[PDB]
Design a protein around this ligand. Structure first.
Ligand SMILES: *[C@@H]1O[C@H](CO[C@@H]2O[C@@H](C)[C@@H](O)[C@@H](O)[C@@H]2O)[C@@H](O[C@@H]2O[C@H](CO)[C@@H](O[C@@H]3O[C@H](CO)[C@@H](O)[C@H](O[C@H]4O[C@H](CO)[C@@H](O)[C@H](O)[C@@H]4O)[C@@H]3O)[C@H](O)[C@H]2NC(C)=O)[C@H](O)[C@H]1NC(C)=O
Ligand SMILES: *[C@@H]1O[C@H](CO)[C@@H](O[C@@H]2O[C@H](CO)[C@@H](O[C@@H]3O[C@H](CO)[C@@H](O)[C@H](O)[C@@H]3O)[C@H](O)[C@H]2NC(C)=O)[C@H](O[C@@H]2O[C@@H](C)[C@@H](O)[C@@H](O)[C@@H]2O)[C@H]1NC(C)=O
Ligand SMILES: *[C@@H]1O[C@H](CO)[C@@H](O[C@@H]2O[C@H](CO)[C@@H](O[C@@H]3O[C@H](CO)[C@@H](O)[C@H](O)[C@@H]3O)[C@H](O)[C@H]2NC(C)=O)[C@H](O)[C@H]1NC(C)=O
Ligand SMILES: *[C@@H]1O[C@H](CO)[C@@H](O)[C@H](O)[C@H]1NC(C)=O
Lengths: 208, 231, 275
């Protein structure tokens, strides 16, 4: 019956910054509001109880405040390990969540490329993998070229979640062709454009 | 400390009854200040409380789930279970068991009912689908000059064409953790998942150290050990 | 020459301090002033015709709950007084005057002024049995409580007894409580809890207290009576003026026969009617 609105949905802040997250209830809820912190791959952690009471294992830089309809969660001095999604909760309803990314110096990716294995090729498919390691920000553009032909519609990528200590990302991009298509062409290359790169970087190999 | 751990199938066909069990270690499941709850999480909903249960027979359920939810307990086993009838693809989620309670505390001049969830399990993925399980193929991502930028070399495993999620990948039986990046799985057009797990190692160690990736896909009862060697 | 209107429609927005004696709770609920929260020490032994409770009020002591909150709140509100009479109970064999860091008074660990946290003495907590006779001609109200430790270790270190039991009796009634050991969320870094209870002792009756541990003991009694005082929740300021009738929205004139400001009134008031 009561619905809560968490603002913002996401934000980025630097180490040492003060960040505040807001949860607002459609009706007054007194002080009956709790906060949780969910780091990647983990379950939520009980952060704050009854609007302002820190729970066990919660660093002092966390605090909460509010009454009635407007509640805030504050991190006084942001740290890299605070990268998480934060949730408000009143009785049986949770807020939508706020994802918090750590802002950081620009870091160019190191790029590696892997040809398809001979075992995979024998079974009829060729997967070429490009690896972009330890970069920031997470915006990156991986382009595949086969004999200097721009590919599209035959690649997929996934990004790791932000590293909780150096605040970098890693990206893997896979290009899949049939064995027949793979051995009809020679040059396989990934072209990587990123803010840390003054020019697009290309990694290639030549057989197939 | 007290710890919770979910157990149950990872793949359930639609219209079946989803069931998961939570086992509680180090704590008295029998104490009527605590309730025992289940919460699920989907990208596109976030966290959704499903229900809780007191061993005294009292229980409370999310009305959005049209009474499809039942939570029951057995103290002979320090366990409580979720049962969710007539599942569809919309019930695909990560499911958490949790301990919590209800307090009637006065503050802001008025007594109000407060709920909380102070202890959570690790969570379990449940995929509701009609497709059948299948184990992955594991192909080497062999280190080469094209994966050696400086004094550092990258190698890994490509874990391809499995269903459903998840797979767990370790390196050298868990003795190798620094530098490992196991990427989230992508779902390809065939309806099967694929992921890669890579690790950056000193290029000097390539001739001396052996590198085994250990892939476990429990839904299909498949374990694969694959050694990655230089090309 | 105004046309007849029998319904009082508006309030002055404030509650007049005359003729009724108004006690503004400010930051303190009546219960917190009753128990003796340190921020509420200025309320000791005060009297009132109308106690006014504020939305901003808050607790700043040991986290507690009151199972029959409304009845205790109404008992004190109608007596119109917080006058406390100390009594010397014989607490032989236990340590008195327990304090906590969640309840600071004058920059020191403290506790509710009207309650007595009893703990073991040399790791012995004897079976206490004390009596208080009530020789007066008015009813006595005794406030006591039960402490719920967070673990068995906590229970042992505090009371040298794994299973505390409390019974408070008179010739007319019997109340038995069992502590519930377990973890609660930290309130002001305290994961334990106290439950507050009350007992009425009629003239000629005796208070009997049995405890083997976990008793938050009374220090005395309050005089109780079903008088004409009351309590009201309101955020309207207390102003200097005279008005016989009081509503949560502020004081009201009592010349019109009817009223549509608020169902809740105090004093000589027009009869409420809806919009
Ligand atoms: C009645 O209660 C109000 C409200 O108290 C406040 O809210 C409660 C819910 C609870 O959280 C209380 O702990 C909390 O104080 C009292 O009014 C507040 O009074 C305090 C101080 O007495 C003020 O706190 C100050 O706020 C400043 C911003 O306006 C801030 O800059 C101050 O920080 C500096 O001072 C503190 C010491 O106070 C020091 O520790 C810091 O390090 C820093 O130097 C300080 O936080 C609140 O702002 C007040 N709030 C309002 C709304 O006025 C009120 O005093 C009380 N009445 C009586 C009679 O007791
Ligand atoms: C007959 O009807 C008139 C007109 O409504 C009443 O007079 C009005 O009474 C209001 C009561 O507060 C006056 O409001 C105040 O006005 C001043 C100046 O504007 C403000 O600064 C102040 O904050 C208040 O808002 C209002 O000024 C007054 N005159 C108007 C509206 O023209 C009259 O009420 C009688 O007079 C008032 C002054 C009080 O003494 C009443 O007790 C009294 O009945 C009405 N008379 C009756 C018998 O109903
Ligand atoms: C636990 O705390 C209570 C109150 O905090 C203690 O009771 C207090 O005991 C002292 C001394 O026994 C009493 O002092 C009195 O002071 C007046 C004026 O200074 C003097 O005229 C009296 O002759 C007497 O010395 C004090 O009144 C009394 N307070 C109450 C409310 O009874 C109690 O002794 C403490 N117990 C322990 C074990 O520390
Ligand atoms: C309380 O103690 C008295 C002491 O004689 C005893 O007679 C009585 O039975 C006790 N009552 C309870 C309920 O333990």
């Amino acid at each position: 019956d009561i619905q809560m609105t968490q603002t913002p949905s996401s934000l980025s802040a630097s180490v040492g910054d003060r960040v505040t997250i807001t949860c607002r209830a459609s009706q007054s809820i007194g002080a009956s509001l709790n906060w949780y912190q969910q780091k990647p791959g983990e379950a939520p952690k009980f952060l704050i109880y009854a609007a302002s009471n820190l729970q066990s294992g919660v660093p002092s830089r966390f605090s909460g405040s509010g009454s009635g309809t407007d509640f805030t969660l504050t991190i006084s001095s942001l740290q890299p390990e605070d990268f998480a999604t934060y949730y408000c909760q009143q009785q049986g309803t949770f807020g939508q969540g706020t994802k918090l990314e750590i802002k950081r110096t620009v870091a160019a990716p190191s790029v590696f490329i892997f040809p398809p294995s001979d075992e995979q090729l024998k079974s009829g498919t060729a997967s070429v993998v490009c690896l972009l390691n330890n970069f920031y920000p997470r915006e990156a553009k991986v382009q595949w070229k086969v004999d200097n032909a721009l590919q599209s519609g035959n690649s997929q990528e996934s990004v790791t979640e932000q590293d909780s200590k150096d605040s970098t990302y890693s990206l893997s991009s896979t290009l899949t062709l049939s064995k027949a298509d793979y051995e009809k062409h020679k040059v396989y290359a990934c072209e990587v454009t990123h803010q840390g790169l003054s020019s697009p970087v290309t990694k290639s190999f030549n057989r197939g | 400390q007290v710890q919770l751990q979910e157990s149950g199938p990872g793949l359930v066909k639609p219209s079946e009854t989803l069931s998961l069990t939570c086992t509680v270690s180090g704590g008295s499941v029998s104490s009527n200040i605590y309730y025992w709850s289940w919460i699920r999480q989907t990208p596109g909903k976030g966290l959704e409380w499903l229900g809780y249960f007191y061993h005294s027979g009292s229980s409370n359920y999310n009305p959005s789930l049209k009474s499809r939810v039942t939570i029951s307990g057995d103290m002979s086993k320090n366990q409580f279970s979720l049962k969710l009838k007539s599942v569809t693809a919309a019930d695909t989620a990560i499911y958490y068991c949790a301990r919590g309670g209800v307090e009637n505390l006065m503050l802001v001049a008025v007594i109000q009912e407060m709920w909380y969830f102070d202890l959570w399990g690790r969570g379990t993925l449940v995929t509701v689908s009609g497709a059948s399980t299948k184990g992955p193929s594991v192909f080497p991502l062999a280190p080469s000059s094209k994966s050696t930028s400086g004094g550092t070399a990258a190698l890994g495993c490509l874990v391809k064409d499995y269903f459903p999620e998840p797979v767990t990948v370790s390196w050298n039986s868990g003795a190798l953790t620094s530098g490992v990046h196991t990427f989230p799985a992508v779902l390809q057009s065939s309806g099967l998942y694929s992921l890669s797990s890579v690790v950056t190692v000193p290029s000097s160690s390539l001739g001396t150290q052996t590198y085994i990736c250990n892939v476990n896909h429990k839904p299909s009862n498949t374990k694969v050990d694959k050694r990655v060697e230089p090309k | 020459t105004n046309a007849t209107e029998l319904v009082q429609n508006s309030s002055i927005g404030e509650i007049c301090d005359s003729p009724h004696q108004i006690l503004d709770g400010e930051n303190c609920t009546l219960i917190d002033a009753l128990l003796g929260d340190p921020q509420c020490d200025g309320f000791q032994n005060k009297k009132w015709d109308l106690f006014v409770e504020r939305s901003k009020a808050y607790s700043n002591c040991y986290p507690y709950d009151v199972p029959d909150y409304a009845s205790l709140r109404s008992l004190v509100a109608s007596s119109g007084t917080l006058e406390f009479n100390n009594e010397s109970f014989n607490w032989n064999g236990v340590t008195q005057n327990g304090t906590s860091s969640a309840c600071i008074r004058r920059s020191n660990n403290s506790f509710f002024s009207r309650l007595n946290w009893l703990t073991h003495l040399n790791f012995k907590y004897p079976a206490l049995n004390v009596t208080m006779p009530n020789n007066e001609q008015f009813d006595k109200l005794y406030i006591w409580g039960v402490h719920h430790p967070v673990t068995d270790k906590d229970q042992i270190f505090l009371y040298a007894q794994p299973s505390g039991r409390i019974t408070v009796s008179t010739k007319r009634s019997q109340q038995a409580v069992i502590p519930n050991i377990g973890f609660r969320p930290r309130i002001r870094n305290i994961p334990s809890r106290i439950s507050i209870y009350w007992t009425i002792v009629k003239p000629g009756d005796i208070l009997l207290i049995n405890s083997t541990g976990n008793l938050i003991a009374p220090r005395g009694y309050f005089k109780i009576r079903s008088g004409k005082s009351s309590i009201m929740r309101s955020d309207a300021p207390i102003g200097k003026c005279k008005s016989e009738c009081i509503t949560p929205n502020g004081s009201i004139p009592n010349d019109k026969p009817f009223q549509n400001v608020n169902r809740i009134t105090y004093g000589a008031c027009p009869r409420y009617v809806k919009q």
